[PDB]
Design a binder for these strands. Structure first.
Ligand code: MG
Ligand code: MG
Ligand code: MG
Ligand code: MG
Ligand code: MG
Ligand code: MG
Length: 221
RNA sequence: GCAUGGUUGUCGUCAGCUCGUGUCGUGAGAUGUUGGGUUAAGUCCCGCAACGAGCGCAACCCUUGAUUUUAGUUGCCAGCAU
């Protein structure tokens, strides 16, 4: 939470595309670009560091959502390190609300990645070549890291509520508390523990999400 | 045969018709099944608030077109004598 470390890149978005209810975090606007106040950020990042206290205390599960283009590389590595669960590519509709039917796809993937190793690897001459191996990559590229999620997630960590409208809407309905990095165009009401920060910078996203890794890997020892 | 069972024609071998869970809408409804390519084909790919499934399409069946082993009778006659 070093203010100098945060001072690297935390700008925001243009003036034309700002949410009027983020004005609390706006400080020292510039020519055509808003700049968010770092003083409140370092204060507010503490709660998200300390709200995530309880959720991971009992070996709970957390979900990372990184559909944004400058997010997949970070969230993938943040969750594999901590033994957590992540989403990189498009968020499947009803991943949480219609979570019961997702297991069928998950169990299907587990079955398929068993036959070439444990069962009859060769069951068809070339049918499995064109269809069976083609679907196993199709399933993993969307399911990704949630393939070992035993139950409903305990908390969510998103990076862009404007680009994760499906996720934030279907997590509120299921009453799961979320933490996320919001920009000058996002909405703070939807998020529980707001972290006003830039989302467009690769380093800025990696800086903040790396703190969450150390936060969770502390208790689970 | 306007009380019915069974059987059949026709649109038409046209490529469509629905369902489970989820979501949007006060509601009838909607989505999936739409959008960009491709195909004989909702046949397949990419995207997508949807994820999958069933009956259909395709294949599995018969027949014709090339060829190997088995078998020489009532079939055939290479090489033969009649
Ligand atoms: Mg009649
Ligand atoms: Mg046809
Ligand atoms: Mg419809
Ligand atoms: Mg189409
Ligand atoms: Mg063809
Ligand atoms: Mg079909």
């Amino acid at each position: 939470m070093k203010q100098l470390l945060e001072a690297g890149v935390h700008f925001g978005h243009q003036t034309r595309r700002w949410n009027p209810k983020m004005k609390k975090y706006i400080f020292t606007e510039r020519n055509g670009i808003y700049i968010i106040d770092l003083q409140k950020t370092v204060k507010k990042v503490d709660e998200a560091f300390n709200f995530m206290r309880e959720v991971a205390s009992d070996n709970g599960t957390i979900l990372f959502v990184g559909t944004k283009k400058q997010a997949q590389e970070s969230v993938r590595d943040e969750a594999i390190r901590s033994g957590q669960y992540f989403v990189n590519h498009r968020w499947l509709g009803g991943t949480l609300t219609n979570f019961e039917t997702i297991q069928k796809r998950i169990q299907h993937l587990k079955k398929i990645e068993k036959m070439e190793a444990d069962g009859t690897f060769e069951v068809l001459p070339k049918k499995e070549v064109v269809l069976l191996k083609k679907e196993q990559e199709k399933l993993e590229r969307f399911l990704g890291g949630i393939k070992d999620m035993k139950g409903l997630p305990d908390a969510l960590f998103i990076v862009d509520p404007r680009k994760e409208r499906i996720a934030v809407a279907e997590a509120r309905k299921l009453h799961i508390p979320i933490i996320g990095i919001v920009d000058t165009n996002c909405d703070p009401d939807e998020i529980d523990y707001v972290i006003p920060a830039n989302d467009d910078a690769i380093r800025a996203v990696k800086l903040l999400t790396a703190k969450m890794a150390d936060a969770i890997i502390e208790v689970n020892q």
